[PDB]
Amino acid sequence: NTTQMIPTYQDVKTGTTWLGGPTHVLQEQHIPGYKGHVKGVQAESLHGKTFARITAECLNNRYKSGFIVDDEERFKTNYQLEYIRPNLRNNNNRQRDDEVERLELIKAQLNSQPKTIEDVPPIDRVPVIGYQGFRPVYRHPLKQVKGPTEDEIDFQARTILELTKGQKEAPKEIPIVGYTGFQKGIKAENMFGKTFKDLSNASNRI
Amino acid sequence: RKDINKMYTQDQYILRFEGKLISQNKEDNHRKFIISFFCGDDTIMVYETADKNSGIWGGKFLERMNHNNPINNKPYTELDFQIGEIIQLGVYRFQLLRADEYTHKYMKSKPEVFKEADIEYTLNHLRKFATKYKSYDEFMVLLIKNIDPNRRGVIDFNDFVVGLRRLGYNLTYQEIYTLMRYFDLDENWKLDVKSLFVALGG
Amino acid sequence: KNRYKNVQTNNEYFQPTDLVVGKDVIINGYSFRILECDEYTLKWFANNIVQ
Amino acid sequence: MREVISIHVGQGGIQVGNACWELFCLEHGIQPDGQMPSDKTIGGGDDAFNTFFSETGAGKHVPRAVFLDLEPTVIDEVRTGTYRQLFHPEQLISGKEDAANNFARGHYTIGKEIVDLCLDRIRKLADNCTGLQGFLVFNSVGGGTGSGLGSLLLERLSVDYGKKSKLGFTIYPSPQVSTAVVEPYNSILSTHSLLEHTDVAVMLDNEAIYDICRRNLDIERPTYTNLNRLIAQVISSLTASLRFDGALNVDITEFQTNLVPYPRIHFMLSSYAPIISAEKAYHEQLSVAEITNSAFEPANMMAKCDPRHGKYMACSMMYRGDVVPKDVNASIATIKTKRTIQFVDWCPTGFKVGINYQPPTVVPGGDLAKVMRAVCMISNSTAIAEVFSRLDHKFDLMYAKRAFVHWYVGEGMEEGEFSEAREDLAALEKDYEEVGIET
Amino acid sequence: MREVISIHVGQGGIQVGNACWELFCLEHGIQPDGQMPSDDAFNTFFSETGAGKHVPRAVFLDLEPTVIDEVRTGTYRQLFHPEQLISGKEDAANNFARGHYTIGKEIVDLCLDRIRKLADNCTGLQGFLVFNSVGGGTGSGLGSLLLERLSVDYGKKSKLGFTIYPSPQVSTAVVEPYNSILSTHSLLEHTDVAVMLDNEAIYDICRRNLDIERPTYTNLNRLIAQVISSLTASLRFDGALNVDITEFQTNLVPYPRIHFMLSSYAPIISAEKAYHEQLSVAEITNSAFEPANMMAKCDPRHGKYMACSMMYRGDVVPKDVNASIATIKTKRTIQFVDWCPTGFKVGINYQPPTVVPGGDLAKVMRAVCMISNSTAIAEVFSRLDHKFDLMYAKRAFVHWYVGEGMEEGEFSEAREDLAALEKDYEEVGIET
Amino acid sequence: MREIVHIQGGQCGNQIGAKFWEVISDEHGIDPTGTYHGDSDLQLERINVYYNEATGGRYVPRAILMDLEPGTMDSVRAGPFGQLFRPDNFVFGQTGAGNNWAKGHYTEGAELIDSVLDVVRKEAEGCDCLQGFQITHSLGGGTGSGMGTLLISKVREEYPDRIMETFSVVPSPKVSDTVVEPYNATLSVHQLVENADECMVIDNEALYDICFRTLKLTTPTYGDLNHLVSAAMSGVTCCLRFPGQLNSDLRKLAVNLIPFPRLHFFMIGFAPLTSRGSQQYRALTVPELTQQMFDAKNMMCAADPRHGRYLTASALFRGRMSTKEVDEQMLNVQNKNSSYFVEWIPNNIKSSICDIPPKGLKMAVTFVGNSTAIQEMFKRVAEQFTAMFRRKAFLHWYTGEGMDEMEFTEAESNMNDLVSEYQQYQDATA
Ligand SMILES: Nc1nc2c(ncn2[C@@H]2O[C@H](COP(=O)(O)OP(=O)(O)OP(=O)(O)O)[C@@H](O)[C@H]2O)c(=O)[nH]1
Ligand SMILES: Nc1nc2c(ncn2[C@@H]2O[C@H](COP(=O)(O)OP(=O)(O)OP(=O)(O)O)[C@@H](O)[C@H]2O)c(=O)[nH]1
Ligand SMILES: Nc1nc2c(ncn2[C@@H]2O[C@H](COP(=O)(O)OP(=O)(O)O)[C@@H](O)[C@H]2O)c(=O)[nH]1
Ligand SMILES: [Mg+2]
Ligand SMILES: [Mg+2]
């Protein structure tokens, strides 16, 4: 954990240490060749991260101790920790943020033209001239449509506006194509014809 | 020797600019050039951009090298590279058109180095010039009647340089761009004098 | 028939006084609410729990 | 108009291929996302990124690669990590069952039904390109899934395409440190097929780095994290001259034409420098004059071989950066005067010199100190025979008790197949001796 | 001033035929009600009413009330001419005989007049597009009988048929072999150009490229839907090189008998993966002939190639056509027949594909549709006969047909044709 | 994707899974209600490895439950995690095996052994890809061993392309719970060898020794013994169900642990395991593995592991380790006992790494190496068969249910040769 804090953004630009840097001015090190017990090398079996880098983690009191790991502190794949973007040299994708916005907006607009409250033209009140069907004799011959209740349409507007530059975050973060994971009930519920990439939104959203 | 501390510390920075070449002929007046300036070791670079179907052989025009201004006879430093200024290279003359959004953040990052970048020093630069007019508010009042002859509430750059230079005040182009770029509400190069005026007075 | 942890009291070992119908109790991730008590049971509350 | 594509296969093949991109990706400014920054809106310059990639009309870029493996574990996780967005979604073909280290499974049982997809992918991957110089495939030899699929793929590459130069960086099991229990078997059978189809093969045995990590990096608890990376610089050096300005460029097709004395013998070993702890790298200037001398140090051979045990046929070494070409003539000169190293009889001069100006970038949180001057070497030395001799014997006993054979026969492989292998090796030890005798 | 009348028979054409109109409408600019929203070439499928909405150029028929009526109540109820959706009441229940010999005789008249009425609006009537699936009892015939009268009712009019044949193994019904055998007999000597649209080939498209594990007949529509929009594109906007309906029957059918061709469409890549690639000309057109993309369940490699005409849409530049085709020829795995030295008919269109709402298809700047007529087609025909061969041997499921008016000898007569059609294929493919 | 199912004959197998299915429950983070309450992404990625899904969103294992009598399953089902099992899979016998191998292998199961076969078969068919089976039974029990083997017999006839694993318990010389043990301890071995692929032999006796000599507790109970053994399962598939540098699937060990077709029996012991209080003083490290992995007291085998020449072994480590200390130590682990290792199979110690560590410990290891030391058990058990059989003691039972002595005579005959052919390799030299 030495790397991401040391060479801090105050160190590179108009600063002393460069990217690699003789990072012994900032903290206490021991210049390789040395014998002793730094109190944190032999006990915790820290891997890689050449001896010099190990020291800084030793005295600065960052550590992580205890035979029993605090759930999260053990539940990482070392793949993730090693290859974590570029971080500190000099200072994710907004994708799927528009996808949700591109998602509901399609939902809302289709919900903005149901012809609420007898707004349909004079035609279409009864079925087409050629209809067959039942047409029960003792029923109000015309059709009745309830439609959205004003506030329902306005409710969608707030979410649409809120998502665009709002507190709402990207929904989950999803895999690419072929991940063979459970995906949270893609089968337990059929969810058959839904454009596999879109399934993740259907999967994790629940 | 070769600067050792210079290479290791300030290596990463890389500035990118777009420009246009000035020469004797019409031949290459409309084609564009992109200039890359490595501040790690003060090496200038020339890159060529060629539009599709234009028929010009796209590629590299000048290899990165090191050469100097004949007049002042001092190697290139970061000071000379500024918006609107003209840098002399070899037997050509190039002009800087626009800056890289990466650059500006680097451009505005270090005041005391690129003074024209410091926003605060820009307005006052114009402010200290208002001493000639007797009444301070008169300098306020005349401005609205000079830069904007129609008092439309919005102006464009091409008139602003002529409008300002019309009075006679001397501002190096690198100051002019910084002011207008601040007041563009929608980021389309449209000044808001009121916002400028409000800062100037209210 | 074995000791079961009590969620309601800091994961403590259960006690006879806990059982109170009308107020819910939980045991090992399950929802229990009693309905009534054996009339033999009522006496036992009626002889010792009184204080 | 110049490029070179990457081949990946086998557990170690995928793992190693992991590192190359970050060192490659970071060099060109390509972050994990694909859009270089969110800020740099100029681009359209320094046309070199085509050397490893292709353009997509607008937006991101795609690495010219196809990922294959017979197991879902490693490949799947790569679909949820930091680099989820780079590789083409449909280009990472995945199998259904593992090879279980059984070579026969990967060459005649399970690899048959998956090689088609890759070969299909390769067709277009070459199609989109224009100036294909040659193919590069990384494959851990000691992998039942890596080998059996590894051996086959090289087979079809000879006929369907043909004369294009193919390169393979295999990693045989360490001379004494081992991981599997039957690694010797998947060693040679993997050795036979690639013998007459791969023009170039270099030694990268794992153990060597183990000493490489400790002696210089000063790592008392190194893990697989730092073994691959140092190799990654090896990959970068060999192809570095094809994507940046160079005073005397060296082409990949100009590599296998100067390190393979005969069409038959096509193996060589390499080594890299300088590796030094960043906390103490700078106090010495791996010195520009002595950088080359670091090249021939036996302790720094990335392969467990003793070049001092044989003559040197030719050296292929590449520097990087602004080292003054004059130093190349001088420093290399001192080697000839040295008596600790002796050449074969018939080769007067066996040094190919390549100079490049771009310096190797520094990884985040890595080991190597961001250095000023470096150099690396690729060599083909008769000492290469040393490893095979020890490898040969390990099988001799194993077949003597025909242990573990029974499962192999269950895969349909002909028992006589093993018969040819030892016949194949007879020349391997035999041919070197003839070349090793001076006129 | 180009017109064409669409004729839909049977449910299979009903569902797809319903599907096809959404593709066209959104490509025109007419809202579902059919009134221009205060916005010529769009006449190609429509006839103006003088002021207001527009009437689609289609007629719907069926012997089943369920499928047809569903259109007459949903979103598009105001789309078609209210009366033109002629409907019967008795379905043949996949009994081919029932569809052409006891009930269909009377209801055909209504169809004949309706088309008789529709054409009168047209002035330069070009041809007919007929939609019908093979695996239908009524679907097999009703289209046929209209085919017989129409061929003798509209003279030399050139026409096309998008038939949907049954899969090599996967089949829903049980008596499919019979009608397919006769249907070809029925449709062997009456049509100009008919395409191969066996469903099983269609599913294979979905999984490999669209990455869908469970698409129903719905998803089959839009992917198939694009085929219809493909062929007719050149007639109803501009282009640097036009290709009309009249200029198909004289460019893909060398002999009056061999007339079965299998087509393909591309590219087809979802919206969540395509953005990685430029979608270049060189990479796309090679997808057209790929064995994994042919829409008819047959091998485009098992036989000779005679002549293949391909139509492009997008902003493609022709030179990407001239260079690519030269590449295709030189390949040593796709080979042309001996007697057609050149067989490329290249089409180019400017407008882009009309992205379906709201649909699955991604957004791309180029699309390709190829019509392939390869000697390997015989595989579909022969496999059909063997199934018919074994089944007919036992006089099974026969009595249900004679009593409706079929003479026993009718089945025997067809079996001659298929092999007769079989005989032609071998002869055409033999080099001189 | 490479998933396995579960089946367990008689009481013995049912109890083993009790603490087992619990363990598989806790590692992935599943409560007794089956609801998901995890924190990181890993704990759900490969949840299909032991659970199928149904409507409503509750996750459950795919376990086949069968037994010949109602007493047992009427006890486990009520316990913790007891409601997880599919009540549909529940079927069982009504008369009981009666501690006799003869009765439970030719009369009862034959009529009903189809029942499990259907329950065995169906669960295998619905999955996408089938990997292997893990069956736990007892050799000293009537229904367990008897019905246990034949179910293994039929399955092999239909699924020859998969692997089969059975955890068998043979009666240790001291703690014998059945007088008629030798017979069912006798007949069973024949059938298991002829069809089994991978076998792990565990003796309850060594379990007691580990508890006292390592845990140093007062009164061990059957629950804890389940605590020790159940974890050992987590060694095999913990690598198989999560990331890793060198994943080691079952077939990876199989190709790396079975040198010969007719030697398919192993002995294993788990580490680490330390007394509760002493947990702090010990400093877990890779060095702390080698000294306890190969140590005698960690060997759950009744036979002394140091009384023979080791052939091959595999290592499946757990926890964040750099293999360097994993690899270098092993080579040291071989030379220091080169007299303890056969000479003609170079490099016969295999290693593997699993990123996710066992719960409650920052590092743990499971050791499996093929050793001739087990030869004591077969020889010790073998001597028991002829002593009772020669007298034909208790022979009416077996002779009372249609069996003969020819099968029994055959059972003794092949046993000696198998060991006899097993002991030959001990003296083999190059
Ligand atoms: N250099 C290097 N070598 C490795 C690494 N991981 C494993 N190896 C070597 O690869 C050998 C095994 O081959 P692998 O490729 O890992 O296994 P595989 O090809 O997937 O074959 P299977 O494991 O049976 O599926 C081991 O003996 C190691 O020596 C690594 O991260 N770096
Ligand atoms: N591509 C596609 N094919 C379909 C669809 N629906 C039905 N089919 C085909 O049609 C066959 C079923 O018979 P149909 O021709 O649809 O029956 P019909 O059109 O209602 O006519 P009748 O059978 O007389 O009722 C099936 O074998 C399918 O191959 C569809 O939605 N899409
Ligand atoms: N692992 C384990 N084994 C047990 C336990 N209790 C008894 N056993 C073993 O189970 C054996 C008896 O099995 P049994 O029920 O007769 O098998 P069955 O006759 O086939 O049903 C005894 O020899 C014991 O060694 C326990 O709690 N745990
Ligand atoms: Mg592997
Ligand atoms: Mg029908």
Question: What is the gist of this entry?
Answer:
Chain A has 206 residues and is mostly helical. Chain A is built from 7 helices and no strands.
Description:
The structure is cut from a larger assembly and holds one copy of chain A (206 residues), one copy of chain B (202 residues), one copy of chain C (51 residues), two copies of chain D and one copy of chain F (430 residues). By secondary structure, chain B is of the alpha+beta class. Chain B has helices at 4-9, 101-109, 119-127, 136-146, 157-167, 173-182, 193-200, and strands at 14-22, 33-38, 43-48, 62-65, 86-89, 92-99. Chain B contains seven helices and six strands. Chain B has a six-stranded antiparallel β-sheet with strand order 4-3-2-1-6-5. Chain C has 51 residues and is an alpha+beta fold. Chain C starts with a strand and ends with a helix. Chain D has 439 residues and is of the alpha/beta class. Chain D has two domains: 3-267, 3-Layer(aba) Sandwich (Rossmann fold), CATH 3.40.50; 268-386, 60s Ribosomal Protein L30, Chain: A. In chain D, strands 4-1-5-6-7-8-11-9-10 form a nine-stranded mixed β-sheet, with helices on both faces. A two-stranded antiparallel sheet of chain D has the order 2-3. In chain D, α5 links the parallel β5 (132-138) and β6 (165-169). The longest helix of chain D has 22 residues, at 415-436. Chain D is globular, with a radius of gyration of 22 Å. By secondary structure, chain F is of the alpha/beta class. Chain F folds into two domains: 3-256, Rossmann fold; 265-374, 60s Ribosomal Protein L30, Chain: A (2-Layer Sandwich), CATH 3.30.1330.20. Chain F has a six-stranded parallel β-sheet, with helices on both faces. In chain F, α1 crosses α6, α5 (108-126) packs across α6 and α6 (142-158) runs parallel beside α7 (181-195). The radius of gyration of chain F is 21 Å and the shape is globular. At the A-D interface, α1, α3 and α4 of A face α1 and α2 of D. Bound molecules: guanosine-5'-triphosphate (2 copies), guanosine-5'-diphosphate (GDP) and magnesium ion (2 copies). One guanosine-5'-triphosphate binds at residues 10-12, 15-16, 64, 91-92, 94, 133, 135-139, 164, 172-173, 199, 217, 220 of chain E. Chain C: It is found in: Cell projection, Cilium; Cytoplasm, Cytoskeleton. Chain C: This is EF-hand protein. Chain E: The active site is at residue 247.
